[PDB]
Amino acid sequence: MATETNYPVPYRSKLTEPFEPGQTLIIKGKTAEDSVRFTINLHNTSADFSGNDVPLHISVRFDEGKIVFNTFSKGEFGKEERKSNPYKKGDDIDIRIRAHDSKFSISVDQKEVKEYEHRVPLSSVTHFSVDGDILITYIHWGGKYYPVPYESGLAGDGLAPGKSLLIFATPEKKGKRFHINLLKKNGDIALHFNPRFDEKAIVRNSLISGEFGNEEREGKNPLEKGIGCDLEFRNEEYAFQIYVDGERFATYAHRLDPHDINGLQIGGDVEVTGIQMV
């Protein structure tokens, strides 16, 4: 227990549906300088058991300096699959678990570190718990396999001021550039967000009636290939506020009425693992 941000340990939570392929569990938190272990368990129960079937047990140990991935079933654990723990007592943590048909995929600071092969049915994760020497600051889950080129309507009300669009993506490793488009009903692009890795810039621009306007670009490109990031398109009243990886990357004064931005478009060298309106 420390500064009440919320999220008390032990933190248990019930899943709406079972944990399907494409969906991701994301657990951020801060660690004290006296922390030895915390744990993440994708389990089932009975309503809530407290020791029955755990398809994916992650134990992060600062004493042993390794992340331990195991699976408790039929009363036992099995062969520990170990892996070097890149964390140091102190600093934040960023564990993100993605289910697939074949296996779990666990990634640290947005960098894949472990491909845990499914040992008992994934269909048995109905709960997840987080426990131990850790302060939890962010636990989110959801998502699906997002096909790219992506295209889809946004909600109904669309993205209007007071709403952010939250996109969790990962630029492809040998990819030169990708784009995201927030769209208006008539066709126009409200904001064209276009990280170009070749030009080492993130070009921002609007497409009005067939023709692209000026093109705003100042900004150290923060994305890195093969690494995943948290793109956030925060629609304020006078500008979008673009957030990359927790911090404001750039603002973009509206060149079009931010009301009724009801379409989304993601192209290029990128994998999309989460979309959500907020």
Question: Which residues bind to ligand BGC, rule: CB under 6 A?
Answer: 192, 194, 203, 205, 212, 215
Residue 93 or 231: which CB sits closer to ligand BGC?
231
Rounded least distance, CB 182 to ligand BGC, Å: 14
Residue 119 or 204: which CB sits closer to ligand BGC?
204
Residue 54 or 270: which CB sits closer to ligand BGC?
270
Rounded distance between C-alpha atoms, residue 12 and residue 96, angstroms:
17
Tokens of 104: 């779990």
Rounded least distance, CB 274 to ligand BGC, Å: 24
Closest CA to 181 of 205, 200, 162, 199: 205
Rounded least distance, CB 116 to ligand BGC, Å: 38
Rounded least distance, CB 267 to ligand BGC, Å: 10
Rounded least distance, CB 230 to ligand BGC, Å: 22
Closest CA to 68 of 99, 114, 24, 108: 114
CA-based max dimension of the chain: 64
**Cβ-closest position to ligand BGC:** 212
Residue 164 or 194: which CB sits closer to ligand BGC?
194
Residue 62 or 193: which CB sits closer to ligand BGC?
193
